[PDB]
Amino acid sequence: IILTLSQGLKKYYGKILKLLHLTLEEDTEGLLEWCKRNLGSNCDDDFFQKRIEEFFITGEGYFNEVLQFKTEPFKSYFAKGFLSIDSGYFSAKCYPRSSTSLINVPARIAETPPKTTINCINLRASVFKEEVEINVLLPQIAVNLSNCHVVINSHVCDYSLDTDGPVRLPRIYHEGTFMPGTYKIVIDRKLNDRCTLVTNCVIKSVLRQYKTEIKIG
Amino acid sequence: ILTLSQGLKKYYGKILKLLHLTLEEDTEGLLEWCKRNLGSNCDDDFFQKRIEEFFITGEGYFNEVLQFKAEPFKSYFAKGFLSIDSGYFSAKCYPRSLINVARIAETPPKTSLKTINCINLRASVFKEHREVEINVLLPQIAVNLSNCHVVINSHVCDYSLDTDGPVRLPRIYHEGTFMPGTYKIVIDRKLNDRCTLVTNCVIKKGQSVLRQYKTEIKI
Numbered sequence A: 001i002i003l004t005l006s007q008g009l010k011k012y013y014g015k016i017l018k019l020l021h022l023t024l025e026e027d028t029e030g031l032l033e034w035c036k037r038n039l040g041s042n043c044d045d046d047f048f049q050k051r052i053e054e055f056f057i058t059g060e061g062y063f064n065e066v067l068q069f070k071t072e073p074f075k076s077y078f079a080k081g082f083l084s085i086d087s088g089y090f091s092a093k094c095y096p097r098s099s100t101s102l103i104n105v106p107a108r109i110a111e112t113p114p115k116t117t118i119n120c121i122n123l124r125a126s127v128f129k130e131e132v133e134i135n136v137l138l139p140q141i142a143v144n145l146s147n148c149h150v151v152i153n154s155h156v157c158d159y160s161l162d163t164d165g166p167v168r169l170p171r172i173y174h175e176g177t178f179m180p181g182t183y184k185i186v187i188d189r190k191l192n193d194r195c196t197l198v199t200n201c202v203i204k205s206v207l208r209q210y211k212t213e214i215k216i217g
Numbered sequence B: 001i002l003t004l005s006q007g008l009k010k011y012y013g014k015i016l017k018l019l020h021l022t023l024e025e026d027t028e029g030l031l032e033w034c035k036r037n038l039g040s041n042c043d044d045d046f047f048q049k050r051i052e053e054f055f056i057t058g059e060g061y062f063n064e065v066l067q068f069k070a071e072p073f074k075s076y077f078a079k080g081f082l083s084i085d086s087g088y089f090s091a092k093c094y095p096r097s098l099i100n101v102a103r104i105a106e107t108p109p110k111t112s113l114k115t116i117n118c119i120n121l122r123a124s125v126f127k128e129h130r131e132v133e134i135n136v137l138l139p140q141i142a143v144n145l146s147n148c149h150v151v152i153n154s155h156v157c158d159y160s161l162d163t164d165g166p167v168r169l170p171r172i173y174h175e176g177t178f179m180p181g182t183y184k185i186v187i188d189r190k191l192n193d194r195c196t197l198v199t200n201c202v203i204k205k206g207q208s209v210l211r212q213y214k215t216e217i218k219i
């Protein structure tokens, strides 16, 4: 029943990741006693939501691994670059606002007449002979992966995805829903053979929309 | 003739001198290292452009030679930051992946840091361990250290200083002189006993006229 320091931290990280809408499952059993024994405060959804908000926006100086700022085992506050929120089943490298100097979340675009090296206003494809990166500029327009293993980078949180379907982006709640403005999807060509991305390619100052299936390898 | 590592350190030395971070350099044999390894000329124009592309208009990946896009620097396996280390001075410079750079009136204290009432300075003491940070908000107004060893952080480049006098900040040239918008000065109290920082404390509604009085921060 009693949870150790690392186990309680991993459960704390697991719930924070689920509120970020990065994972679809969680394991948060036993977190109430770990908080009231180490943190000393309640760990309800309000506590976490405020912690996520304070971390990604309105950040102030240093913090701790429990994502607490200040203007017993987590009182050292030797963290300002980034924080590695790792629950054991899914890891994420999240960057605080203290490192950055997120949009406030749309419309549906009309249809234009190929669905299968592209020419999209919303997509930027780069090929490094060293991998393939497909940067997107319209994060609300989704890019569903299929039979793929990617790592997506951003200015809010970097992490790797293998679940097929819609890409899960972090979403902060502070007077509304805040989503990143743009994210980049890197794909290792050397296991990713049958990887297919289905997206909506945008053609031009009115914009147009047509589906396309971009496959790598 | 200079080896690969030695040529890189001299390459870093010239970039550091152009950044106005160091006052001395060792660049003898650097042109031969460039035309033999880089394949391009290594004049002040070449370096100035490399500094320009690195700190502004940066786009994606680069190499330790500050080039963006047997050729030992064609793999472009470098992201995040670059450690410009010449052997005599190290600096962790971050690419964008800067202000453009007035006199304030005078007001009538001459010396703790718990209270300095400065609009230009934000003094924090981290009892969280053993360190003192004095954030500055007006980089043009200089803070001269005396008998001190600090490490200054910024959004352009982190490095440590021990030379007494004005703090040396990076300066990028692109249609003008660009300096960082704000820098942080950390001081480890646990060798840094005789440290004295002399700065211009800013005192005194939106209609408030701006004022200035000298102050000597003792640690």
Ligand SMILES: *[C@@H]1O[C@H](CO)[C@@H](O)[C@H](O)[C@H]1NC(C)=O
Binding pocket: A104, A105, A174, A175, A176, A177
């Ligand atoms: C975000 O947008 C919503 C739109 O209704 C608005 O109500 C809210 O105040 C905005 N929040 C911020 C922080 O801009």
Ligand SMILES: *[C@@H]1O[C@H](CO)[C@@H](O)[C@H](O)[C@H]1NC(C)=O
Binding pocket: A142, A143, A144, A166, A198, A199, A200, A211
């Ligand atoms: C991604 O999947 C969702 C859910 O089925 C779908 O509505 C959307 O159209 C897909 N993406 C594109 C670009 O079609």
Ligand SMILES: *[C@@H]1O[C@H](CO)[C@@H](O)[C@H](O)[C@H]1NC(C)=O
Binding pocket: B099, B100, B175, B176
């Ligand atoms: C700085 O001033 C110079 C000289 O007028 C100008 O060319 C340059 O665009 C300015 N840069 C910024 C960022 O204001």
Ligand SMILES: *[C@@H]1O[C@H](CO)[C@@H](O)[C@H](O)[C@H]1NC(C)=O
Binding pocket: B141, B142, B143, B144, B166, B198, B199, B200
């Ligand atoms: C620092 O040194 C310069 C040297 O010219 C001097 O003018 C200035 O008054 C000193 N103090 C400050 C706060 O800059």
